[PDB]
Amino acid sequence: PSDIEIAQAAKMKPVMELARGLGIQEDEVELYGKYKAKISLDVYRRLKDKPDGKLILVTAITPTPAGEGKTTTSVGLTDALARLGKRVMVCLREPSLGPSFGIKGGAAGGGYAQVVPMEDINLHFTGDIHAVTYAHNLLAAMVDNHLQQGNVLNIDPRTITWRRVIDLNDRALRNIVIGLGGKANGVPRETGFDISVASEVMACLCLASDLMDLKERFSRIVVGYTYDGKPVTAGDLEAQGSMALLMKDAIKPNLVQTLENTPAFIHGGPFANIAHGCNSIIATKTALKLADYVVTEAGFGADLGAEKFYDVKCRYAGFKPDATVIVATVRALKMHGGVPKSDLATENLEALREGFANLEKHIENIGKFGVPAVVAINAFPTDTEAELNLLYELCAKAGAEVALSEVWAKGGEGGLELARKVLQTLESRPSNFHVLYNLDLSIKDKIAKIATEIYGADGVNYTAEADKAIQRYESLGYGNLPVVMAKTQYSFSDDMTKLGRPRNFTITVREVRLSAGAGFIVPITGAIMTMPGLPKRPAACNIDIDADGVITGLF
Amino acid sequence: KVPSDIEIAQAAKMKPVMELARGLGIQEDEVELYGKYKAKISLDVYRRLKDKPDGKLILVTAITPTPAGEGKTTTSVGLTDALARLGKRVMVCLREPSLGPSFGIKGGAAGGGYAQVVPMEDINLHFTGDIHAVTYAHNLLAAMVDNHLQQGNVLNIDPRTITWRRVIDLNDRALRNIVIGLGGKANGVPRETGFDISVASEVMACLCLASDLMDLKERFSRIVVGYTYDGKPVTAGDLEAQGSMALLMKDAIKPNLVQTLENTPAFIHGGPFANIAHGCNSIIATKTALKLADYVVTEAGFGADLGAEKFYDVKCRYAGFKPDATVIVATVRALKMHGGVPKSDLATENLEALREGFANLEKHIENIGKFGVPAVVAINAFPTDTEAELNLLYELCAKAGAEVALSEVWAKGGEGGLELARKVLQTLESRPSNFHVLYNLDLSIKDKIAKIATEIYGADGVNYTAEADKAIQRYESLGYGNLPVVMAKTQYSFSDDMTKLGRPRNFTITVREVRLSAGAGFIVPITGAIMTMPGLPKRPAACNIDIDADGVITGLF
Ligand SMILES: Nc1ncnc2c1ncn2[C@@H]1O[C@H](COP(=O)(O)OP(=O)(O)O)[C@@H](O)[C@H]1O
């Protein structure tokens, strides 16, 4: 059937059951209807000394338009592990609302490997993204107001880096002039809007230890500079309290479940380019004390998500990932061997071997962190046996454990093979985890290592702006932070057409922005889209809902 | 004695709302919890109770507002709580406040002292997310307008005539006048526009006047966003936005159950502007109450010239409600302001200035009379009032033929409103109402405007600018001429001059502009300058607001 038909055919257990079965007190649960809830921060605070379960990351090979299925696999693996009688959770990211009205409206996973309720997840859910948005825009309000009231701190409005947010895809608000209409109405200036999920505030929600840490981060944010170049912060404006208060429910992870009633957290949902691409630390760390096994994931390929997962999230949280799955398809692999999307159903053993180079590299890279990999093949109905076997073999020739996953079609039952290979790994392969780089390196040094060790670049080139920008940040003492690489995702390089694995290439860093709040540095290599726009016939036009509450055109 | 408002909210033991739901005859499968102290009730409740008779309906209004405060929500809640003590099956319906104030001027409890609806913190903050949904539907439509320009402008909208602005629920002056669409041909179509505070949104007004979800959708469809180069209106229906907007409001349409400090059940739902709109809580909420209780108390923004008039002439009209009684809140202090006494010396007894400002109150009673609804005055007692002033207030209320009661509900809760409650009940038992609207829809716009201005405001007559005269002809030509009228006027006078206190005579109202709400289904004549988006003060509340590890809040109230 279809993703949505399946969600609706499903039978959901009240979430309080699940809460209780995990050893969550009824006074720590906060229902939003009988199938979603917020879990207090007190749970972690009281289980602070229990041991952490096993931490498992689901990443993948370089994205293609032919599709990977990295979420499907986190949920299916999770549903197999439940069927082997394991005490397991899954942690996932909340999607933006914006797609639902432009292009998609999509399942959190797909087939018989989703998290539910699907409707609520795609609409307002528990309002987490409304609170980010209000927190971001209050700050900007307070900025523009502070100019109006004499601008005591002597900010140069033209230097302001803090923009606005909204969780709709509105190209019209990319570049605006505000502050018009007179001396009563503010100070004219050039600014604009980004999509709310790209908010530094969303990044902070996802890297905070607790509410008081969320507040200190807020206070550290850079909104702009004085006429002399001194930086001004959210704390210079006394914004941090108000913004923390506006997030007091948002900071609590949201408990949901799979089609098969395995417990799931959904919490946070940042960008994976100008930010790190994970769900929150709060949820993953809470899941760790509530389960023996935690399955989580990260955006884009392992060159980006996984690398940041390890180098940002784990570093902050003090997590030691115990294993990592890497997803791949025979379809996707052939594209990396030059086959076009048109011809993906024609068998091509030759193309599959060449395209394998993409996967081979990721495995090596995952190697670099001392985490035991496992390849998981997403089964696809037009894949011939010759192909699959050849893949299986090539992973083994690369010394990698590999499994067939049919979790899309068959649910927890299609994940069993993979689950077993995962369990086989946890018990018998102790992880030797370490960050790829030290924080004391310079900014250029950190970018080199990643660019050379992870992307396979000969080296890195900097523009005059980027050079001047790094020289400034280091001089303000922002130089011993991590680094978050804003690159394309469709290649190891920064050339979207250079399908993996290219050699003899260099990476170029065109701009450098700062996220003092989240606590990192962002090198840009391409033009980055922080606010997408609607297509010619947006989905909104065809969405409807009748008298009986039956919805259409949403999925 | 009396603690702070927030000290009181936290000291009060709330009952799980599910109990309260059941106490009201609501089935488990009609309730949807947001924690154990908030809930959304199904619209199917009203549907299965459609044939039950209605409870009594009791409107709480007030005299002309001042800075110096009135006391209307506090009365609404205290009245409710007294009625509950007297053994009656009663509900109160109120508006959800905007988020914005909490970060500028102050967070205002929903009521005050011992007359509060709770949980306080949640109602002021995100509550059940109704205002966020209103915000997302409004701005989705606006995104859909700009996109339509970008994609070949098939409907031939002239960007420069676009009336549909955007919204956000924060007080941000810098966004009032903006230019968007800049950056090249890939980034939209440059144009002048702006933001308004989310509670001003026609979307909000539509939420508060919809019969149910399919009706709220139809309204949405009728909304006018701009005009073609030829002058033809382009509706949100024309851009097929109404289904999505409705879908974005699927939980927002359900009234939210909560309660008072004394566990009397309560609905908070909807929250519009009382000037460019009607200043009332939702019809959905009010009509459901009327099926689940023998007594329903609700209220309207601003003084009775504005809210009451709109409650009667828009809300009750659309709903088929017939108000059985109406309460008017006055204070001694404010009545002296209306007889000339400035705020600095309001504590000083002054019988002569009190006698003079009573004129304000006198005029409102008369006006309430014009709708066939028996009035009852509620004197909101304040500790510096002398007994001589109070007795002279009671005398003047009798000489003017209105029952009257002292109300000490701020200090003493339900007990402090028993005397008023009993007067209200005397009136329901003995003076059934003769409710009629003020005006027929068939009058012309200028006729309806004149009826309000002369009958209610006390005006000699009404003047128009050339712009207004163009707008009115335009609206009448397009057939929006048999609509109700929603007068955006200052609240601090009967006049449109915010300094003319009391009961001004020999005066004339002037209508500078006229906007249209096709979706909410009314015409809006503007008499002043109208602030649809306030700004923050020199030292905003946000600067002094904090929250520590123990979850303790400060500087929020
Ligand atoms: N009798 C009273 N004593 C002290 N304070 C009062 C009294 N009545 C009202 N207030 C306070 O003064 C303000 C006026 O009452 P409120 O219900 O807030 O006004 P309204 O709803 O009429 O705008 C309120 O914030 C309320 O808390």
Do the beta carbons of residue B403 and residue B378 sit within 8 Å?
no
Whole-angstrom Cα distance, residue B434 to residue B184?
63
Q: What is the 3-state secondary structure (H, E, C) of A275-314?
A: CCCECCHHHHHHHHHHCCEEEEEECCCHHHHHHHHHHHHH
Output the residue whose Cα is nearest ligand 1's atom 14: B71
Architecture of domain B130-248: 2-Layer Sandwich (3.30)
B163 is annotated as contributing to ligand binding: no
Helix (H, G, I), strand (E, B) or coil at B23: helix
DSSP state of B260: E
Do the beta carbons of residue B213 and residue B249 sit within 8 Å?
yes
CA distances from A128 to A254, B120, B545 (A): 9, 20, 21
Active-site residue, selected from the candidate residues B311, B371, B410, B557? B410
Catalytic site includes residue A300: yes
For the domain with range A442-531, which CATH number is right: 3.10.410.10, 3.40.50.2300, 3.40.640.10, 3.40.50.300? 3.10.410.10
Ligand 1 and B8: CB distance under 6 A: no
Closest CA to A254 of A513, A18, A536: A18
Q: What angle do CA A102, A105, A110 make, to 5 degrees?
A: 150
Give all strands (DSSP E) within B127-203, no chain letters.
Answer: 166-168, 178-180, 191-193, 195-197
Q: Mutual orientation of helices A416-428 and A70-83 as an angle, nearest 10°?
A: 80
Closest CA to B425 of B385, B376, B383, B389: B376
> Which of A131, A184, A553 lies closest to B126 in CB terms?
A131
CATH superfamily of A128-246: Domain 2, N(10)-formyltetrahydrofolate synthetase (3.30.1510.10)
Whole-angstrom Cα distance, residue B1 to residue B315?
40
Architecture of domain A1-127+247-441: 3-Layer(aba) Sandwich (3.40)
Ligand 1 and B299: CB distance under 6 A: no
Whole-angstrom Cα distance, residue A21 to residue B229?
64
Q: Which residues pair with B405 in a beta bridge?
A: B378
- Domain positions in chain B are 1-129+249-443, 130-248, 444-533
Whole-angstrom Cα distance, residue B489 to residue B502?
16
Could you give the count of Cα atoms lying within 13 Å of B214 in the half-sphere of its Cβ? 6
List of chain A residues whose C-beta atoms are within 8 Å of the C-beta of residue B541: 242
> Which of B147, B543, B553 lies closest to A245 in CB terms?
B553
List of chain B residues whose C-beta atoms are within 8 Å of the C-beta of residue A148: 173-174, 535
Residue type for position A523: P
Catalytic site includes residue A429: no
Span from the CA of B63 to the centroid of ligand 1 (angstroms)? 13
Whole-angstrom Cα distance, residue B309 to residue B287?
19
Q: Do B173 and A142 touch (CB under 8 A)?
A: no
Q: Please give the residue of chain A at the shortest CA–CA distance from B535.
A: A145
Task: Identify from B145, B171, B536 which residue to disrupt to test chain A contact, counting A C-beta atoms within 10 A and taking the largest count.
Answer: B536
H/E run at residue B327: strand B325-330
Q: Do B147 and A534 touch (CB under 8 A)?
A: yes
Active-site residue, selected from the candidate residues A193, A218, A380, A492? A380
CATH superfamily of B444-533: Formyltetrahydrofolate synthetase, domain 3 (3.10.410.10)
| φ, ψ of residue A77 in degrees (nearest 5) | -50, -45
Q: Do A177 and B179 touch (CB under 8 A)?
A: yes
Whole-angstrom Cα distance, residue B482 to residue B486?
13
Catalytic site includes residue B371: no
Catalytic site includes residue A284: no
**Which two three-digit tokens encode residue A82?**
């439940």
Span from the CA of B303 to the centroid of ligand 1 (angstroms)? 14
Give all strands (DSSP E) within B427-512, no chain letters.
Answer: 461-464, 508-511
Class of the CATH domain delimited by B1-129+249-443 = alpha beta
Cα torsion A212, A162, A472, A188: sign:
negative
List of chain B residues whose C-beta atoms are within 8 Å of the C-beta of residue A176: 178-180, 182
Active-site residue, selected from the candidate residues B195, B302, B321, B494? B302
